[PDB]
From a paper:
Glutathione, the tri-peptide γ-L-glutamyl-cysteinyl-glycine, is the main low molecular weight thiol antioxidant in both plant and animal cells, often present at millimolar concentrations in vivo. It is synthesised in a two-step, ATP-dependent, process: glutamate-cysteine ligase (GCL) catalyses the formation of γ-glutamylcysteine (γ-EC) from glutamate and cysteine, followed by the addition of glycine by glutathione synthetase (GS) to form glutathione. Cyst nematodes have exploited a series of gene gain events to redeploy glutathione synthetase-like enzymes during parasitism, within the syncytial feeding cell formed in the host root. The most recent expansion has been coupled with a diversification of structure and biochemical function that has given rise to enzymes that are introduced into the host cell, and likely possess novel substrate specificities.
To explore the catalytic capacity of nematode GS-like genes, the G. pallida representative of Clade 1 (Gpa-gss1), one representative from Clade 2 (Gpa-gss5) and a number from Clade 3 (Gpa-gss12, Gpa-gss17, Gpa-gss22, Gpa-gss24 and Gpa-gss30) were heterologously expressed in, and their proteins purified from, bacteria. Remarkably, each stage of the evolutionary process that gave rise to GS-like effectors has witnessed at least a 10-fold reduction in apparent glutathione synthetic rate, such that Clade 3 GS-like proteins have not retained canonical enzyme activity. In contrast, none of the Clade 3 GS-like effectors accepted any of the tested terminal amino acid substrates in combination with the γ-EC backbone. Variability in the glutamate portion of the di-peptide binding pocket is ubiquitous in G. pallida Clade 3 GS: of the 24 GS-like effectors there are 21 different amino acid compositions in these 6 positions, not one of which is canonical.
Residue numbers in the entry:
A (entry chain A): 34 to 68, 82 to 129, 142 to 148, 155 to 214, 218 to 315, 324 to 365, 372 to 387, 405 to 414, ...
B (entry chain B): 34 to 68, 82 to 129, 140 to 151, 155 to 214, 218 to 315, 324 to 365, 372 to 387, 401 to 414, ...
The structure:
Amino acid sequence: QYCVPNIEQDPQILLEQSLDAKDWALSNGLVKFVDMMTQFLPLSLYPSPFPRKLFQQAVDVQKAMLLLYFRASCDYEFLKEAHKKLVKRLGIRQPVAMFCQRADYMASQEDDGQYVLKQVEVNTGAIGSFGTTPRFSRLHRRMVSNAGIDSVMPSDQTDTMAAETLYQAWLEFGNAEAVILFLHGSPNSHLMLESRQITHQLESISTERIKCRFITITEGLNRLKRDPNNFSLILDDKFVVAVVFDRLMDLNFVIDHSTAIKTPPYIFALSHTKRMQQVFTKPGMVEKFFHMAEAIRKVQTKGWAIPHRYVLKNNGDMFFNEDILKKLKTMAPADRDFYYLTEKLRPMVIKNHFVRPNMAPTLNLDATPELGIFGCLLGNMETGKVSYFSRTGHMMKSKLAFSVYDSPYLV
Amino acid sequence: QYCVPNIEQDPQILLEQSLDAKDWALSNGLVKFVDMMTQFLPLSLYPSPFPRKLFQQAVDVQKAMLLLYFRASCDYEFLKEAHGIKKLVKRLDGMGIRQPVAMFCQRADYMASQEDDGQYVLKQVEVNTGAIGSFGTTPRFSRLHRRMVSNAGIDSVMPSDQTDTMAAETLYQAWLEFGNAEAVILFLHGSPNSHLMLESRQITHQLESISTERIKCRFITITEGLNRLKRDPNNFSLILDDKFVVAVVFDRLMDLNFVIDHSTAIKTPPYIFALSHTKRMQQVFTKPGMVEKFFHMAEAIRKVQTKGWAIATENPHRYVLKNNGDMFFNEDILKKLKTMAPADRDFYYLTEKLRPMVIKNHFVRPNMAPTLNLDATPELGIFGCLLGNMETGKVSYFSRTGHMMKSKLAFSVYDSPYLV
Ligand SMILES: [Mg+2]
């Protein structure tokens, strides 16, 4: 069976492959801004092994997972019932929402010793790793291939996926002269290069020369206004904005209550609290929006509202072992409504090598991988109908048993 | 006709396109090590205009240009007769030849020069070999600028360059001529963070995808090479870590250097070529007969030469007093001629100063605002490689040609030609 130590154990060769991997990263956009310069993103040298069945189980449930959170997001009454500054803020001026999600998974060791797929988190909005993912995927196919080893390292085109979904959003807005807005926190934001890499894909999947305009949120106070008649969002008094691609406040809701397609609109932030994820583990709550429901139940982890088997988590800081009893007695009952109890997962431990900026590589570490599955929707929130499902994507992150980008090798 | 100002003159839009161009560079290896981190390479925002005929004239003469310097390099007595240079001769004299097969890659540089009618002619500024810059950077700038131009609606006028591939294809052919399946290719650098390092790595990314059997490329600094490289006393083959035979030593920038040079590894190129690429020699090739001797390819070469006279008094601004391997202009040329001691006379020559083509472009630099609507003078570099046997003087392989451009103010910037 594939495992990373049995590829190579000469330290001098592993060191030389570290420098090679790192120099490939520096040559292919696997970088971030620091200080302002660029630095490569920490990476595992080789792809970590991962069960084929569970990866397929995670990939297959993504369609269902988007549909559940999309439909929950179309039912504001439901979301409110499941739980204050966000509610205060929240007819609809743009029914069409673009909705991209990353579901995270851990292969978890049940008793018997066999691994089962269990979902760690769902994320939407200012999502990391659209641009980095297809590149790490290529990095690791190259390392593996260069060492002689071998469908077991599945293709990821997640930069393309994002591009194809933005293009479809632009088309649904239906204005040939309209632009796509990339809204960042700063010029050197940690999302900036992933954002730019999305546009490099958008260019090569169109004739149309779609203008993408990169603006910070500070400069947006002067350069974005809303039309008082159309309620359309305008840039520099001249350009209609078809899509606002949020890449990380009064302005934010002025944008949200306008005809531009949001990615996704603010209502989705309410449907992706950890409270809500915990609420979906209660009986009936998935079935309500729907088989896709059973597939979803298989990956859930029962979480109970208000000791080494459990974790006390906050719902939006967490306690393990005897600290759970310590915090339970200590805690005032006002705070009880902000935490929940879940079963602690026994995570799969594998061996790999870790390559970091300005340090020697760490060889033969125990690490636990975490699988992220990407998927996007284009849907209408007044009808609840979906018009577009994007291709799926997938990435991985390993931490010691601070993290590292990785990619799965399907054992 | 194409010119850069008539693309766009909104400063806010030019600024936004600067950041875009720069972020594309950071995403595609147009970077170097600094400080240790990475920084993007300064670039022109748009490709600078360049005459179609002269570019074709430069591309077409490259085959001839490699053949002349290759054949001059096969004739040690000729090179000696044409003359640090004392230190290089001393060495070559210690060495028969253990590896006849040389790999020979050249970059010839050109300026479009304004003759008196007002029309531009191609004139060669320099030839370079050995630790050559811009193998890896060139195809990427080429792609950068095709993208900027295309994204702005403008349009064979921006010719494809695969110079990373070119280098790879020539190393692969060198490895094959050595003929040992278990032999490695050595990349010799000055340091781990050398300015050539990422261009070197990018060559290997191309070498991987033009073969099935993974050729091992081993990256070593020259300091580490003192412990890890020895020569076999029987084969005279160069060995790495007592285990790996080295088929090709790819020099990317001293006793060790000539221990490597006098061994069976293919050099890139061997040290003799450093003697044939002095500026003295380039100046010697401008004298009558000296090109014709190795050869029409000769006339093509004569067209791009600039007469240079060894060691005026009416239009001294037409001339420059250059060093042959620091230079004097205008009335200083007459001043320094009389002043100068005859020891120094053998290290300088007189050439015609070229009146260079000035174009407008925008310059994008790290951590500053872009400089819009500068006058700049572009400089065209044509790449080509050989694989040849120096005992017979026969060539077995000619690589594809490549091309790059660099613009300076009328500090420099990577550019690419738009063929007006
Ligand atoms: Mg004068």
